[PDB]
């Protein structure tokens, strides 16, 4: 019951992590859906990298159950020749292999420090969830609120938040979010023919950003 708090999501909280994402995220995620992805362990431990970053907030209700989480990571400034190690390489899942091959190239096609040059560091919000038990209470916009004292007491004033999901940029809008970058699954034809024809509100790619 609540009260609810907003801690820091530690490693320890992986597995809980994980749980509650199964319950409340991935299947929601239209990429997902359209693949029909099934139990997916490379999804799990992909989900799972932000948190040594220190920056990802999971609410905690009074029976210890966590009811939301915001997963976040750092990204610091990329100098011209640095290449990213590619997501999809190595992938054992053909499913989720395609999902990270279309991020690895949004990551070519897109680089959110050439909207915010002078920026040095921005904060990537990665998974928003919240328990369907307790949605409409203004969770997912305290779970916000926590990382914007994070980058308040670190200097950073951009939140960056890739959504593939036409209903996730509009809840981020809602948050004050406003979008940079849009690649149409109907344009993604990385050998000539499209891979992704998710259902028609999810158009695309969105890349949400606030300057805050
Ligand atoms: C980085 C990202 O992943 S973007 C975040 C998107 N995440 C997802 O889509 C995962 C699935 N959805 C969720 O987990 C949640 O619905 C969230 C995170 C989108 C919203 O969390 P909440 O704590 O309910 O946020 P909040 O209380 O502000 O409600 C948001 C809206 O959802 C609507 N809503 C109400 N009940 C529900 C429900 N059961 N399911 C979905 N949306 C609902 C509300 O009316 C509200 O509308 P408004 O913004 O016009 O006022």
Redesign the pocket.
């Known amino acids: 019951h609540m009260p609810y708090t907003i801690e820091l999501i530690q490693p320890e909280d992986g597995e809980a992590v994980i749980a509650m994402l199964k319950t ?2 991935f299947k ?1 995620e239209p990429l997902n859906t359209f693949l029909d992805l099934g139990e997916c362990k490379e999804l799990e431990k992909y989900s799972l990298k932000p948190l040594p970053d220190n920056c990802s907030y999971k609410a905690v209700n009074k029976k210890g159950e966590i009811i ?1 989480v ?1 997963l976040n990571g750092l990204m610091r400034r990329p100098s011209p020749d640095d290449v990213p190690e590619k997501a999809a390489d190595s992938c054992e899942h053909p499913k989720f292999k395609k999902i990270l091959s279309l991020m690895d190239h949004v990551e070519e096609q897109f680089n959110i420090f050439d909207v915010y040059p002078d920026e040095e560091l921005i904060l990537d ?8 038990n ?8 305290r ?1 916000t609120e926590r990382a914007y004292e994070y980058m308040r007491e670190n200097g950073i004033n951009v939140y960056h ?3 593939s ?1 036409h ?3 509009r ?2 809008e ?2 004050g979010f406003h979008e940079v970058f849009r690649m149409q699954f109907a344009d993604y034809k990385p050998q000539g023919e499209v891979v992704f024809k998710p259902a028609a509100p999810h158009v695309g790619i969105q890349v949400m950003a606030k300057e805050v």
Request: charged residues 10%; positive net charge.
């Open positions: 409340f995220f929601a939301g915001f919000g990665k998974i928003l969830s919240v328990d369907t307790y949605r409409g209470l203004g969770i997912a916009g779970l938040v890739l959504c999901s209903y996730s940029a809840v981020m809602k948050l």
